[PDB]
Symmetry: D3
């Protein structure tokens, strides 16, 4: 995940940040205080950016030609995942955070299949 | 974990980073090229620091006074965990990586108990 | 402070960042411009976060088991200081920035004693 | 490039970092001092990582479905560019930096065609 | 620009970041949604800070005493440029973004003269 | 120091980071372990870089045109300090860390005068 390569990767890193994104979006419906809303927006932006970075590192550093060969939809899925995270940044609606998580979940299934044997 | 509070924590964040530290240590044992050794040292330093931040965060942002009362040894455990990580930082021996992982696993145990 | 170890520590690093937090809280009371309010919120989150990092570093990298023996309340003190910094992140009230300073002043008092003996 | 979106992007950001990567690799053949070699390796790693981040941001934030439609090789080219930057990180040979630059150059031509009308 | 020295500099790094500042200012004028305004404010602050770092770097790491002698006004220009960027940070008016861009263009002019 | 402006500045931030630089240079003379030498090199690059940021910040965000009028050599002084910090990044010799400190001490002297009048 660090590009040594160390060969340690886990889509859980991207998932956990994306789970924070959604958690924040949900908290934003419960407290209309301007200061709270602003801190939530600041922190959402950061966690969504870290999520994007973890997704991108998987795609660049972990996934290799035989994976792209076996999963020809994987390039586009990764791109759709990043754009869903951007749409989450730009939105207070938890449905957008959830969409990002659903995409990451497709990445995680593919990841673990490639880790098998 | 982002201090909103957002309420999402998982010691897996510390864990995966400390696993990377150990993995890098293991690889340093295999290949003595100076350039590689240096890159491994750079990376190990980053990963260990990240792991420390995650551990420090659980301690300050997740754990609360009722937990420190029920687990009177938790402050020292977290301190020892951070010191273990500093020691893995300073070392190429994967056993130091593993010691940090062992301490993290003690924290994870407590963490999931408090989730019940 | 850099974990080499280099042996250069000073709670002044935590203190100056916590002073910035309090000073930003004080400025927010003087200008209701929503853009200023938002920038102040961005800056206060960052500074408070750096203050927490400096405080954690002292506890993990400077203080050692004999210090914890001699000051059995140091563990809880450091935890309280970080929670006070998080409470100031979440607030516009300078009294919260002050409270974080109060705790930092207690750590600073212990620190300099350990530099004597 | 910041994901507002601000709509300001330029592959020159990724190019300039990748030009530093190569410059460092070339400087590494001229001075065998261990300390110099170490600082060069440290700085190479950083600039290659920033290059990767600029390439990834183009792919995720600037490029859109009609671009991927018109350039069906663009996903793979971006992936090859990132791996070339990783191979540059892992290498003292300026030919690896140059390969990363040749890839970025293909991205830059495509970028500017999509910016036309 | 990375302090090796690597010898690669281009005021385009400051420029593109300051162009992003101005672009964000322009967009703030178009859409008064609070969430959007906040995100624009977050981003503008980051981009402006990055631009400052690039400018400060040219000044310390690229420019040398012979340049400061040939261009006695360069120290003040760079200082003014950083202050312009701080002012764009504090403002939603794209004219402040443009002022910072104008100062950067003065630096770029001098920079390319010294490359000849 | 955070560009709000918040009005909290102290050259002690630059000073403590430059002390770390010098202290790391001194440690490198005491332990020839190649792994230690490399970590010391990593840490010294980072600390020196933070010191340069703190020095630049004072010059850009704290000092103002009347200060530059009263101290016409302040511009060159700040430039010299940053070049001295870069020279210490590039060196193992503590004399270079010391020189960076010497310059910082001169800025600190001017700073506190401007806090009086
Ligand atoms: Cl890797
Ligand atoms: Cl939290
Ligand atoms: Cl230390
Ligand atoms: Cl964008
Ligand atoms: Cl340079
Ligand atoms: Cl300020
Ligand atoms: Ni890795
Ligand atoms: Ni959180
Ligand atoms: Ni240190
Ligand atoms: Ni942008
Ligand atoms: Ni450079
Ligand atoms: Ni400030």
């Amino acid at each position: 995940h660090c590009d040594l390569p160390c060969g340690v990767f886990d889509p859980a890193q991207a998932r956990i940040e994306a789970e924070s994104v959604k958690a924040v979006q949900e908290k934003m419906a419960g407290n209309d205080d301007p200061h709270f809303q602003t801190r939530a927006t600041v922190i959402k932006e950061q966690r969504a950016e870290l999520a994007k970075h973890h997704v991108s590192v998987l795609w660049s550093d972990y996934f290799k030609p035989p994976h792209f060969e076996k999963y020809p939809e994987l390039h586009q899925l990764v791109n759709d995942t990043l754009k869903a995270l951007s749409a989450a940044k730009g939105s207070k609606d938890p449905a957008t955070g959830q969409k990002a998580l659903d995409y990451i979940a497709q990445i995680d299934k593919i990841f673990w299949e490639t880790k098998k044997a």
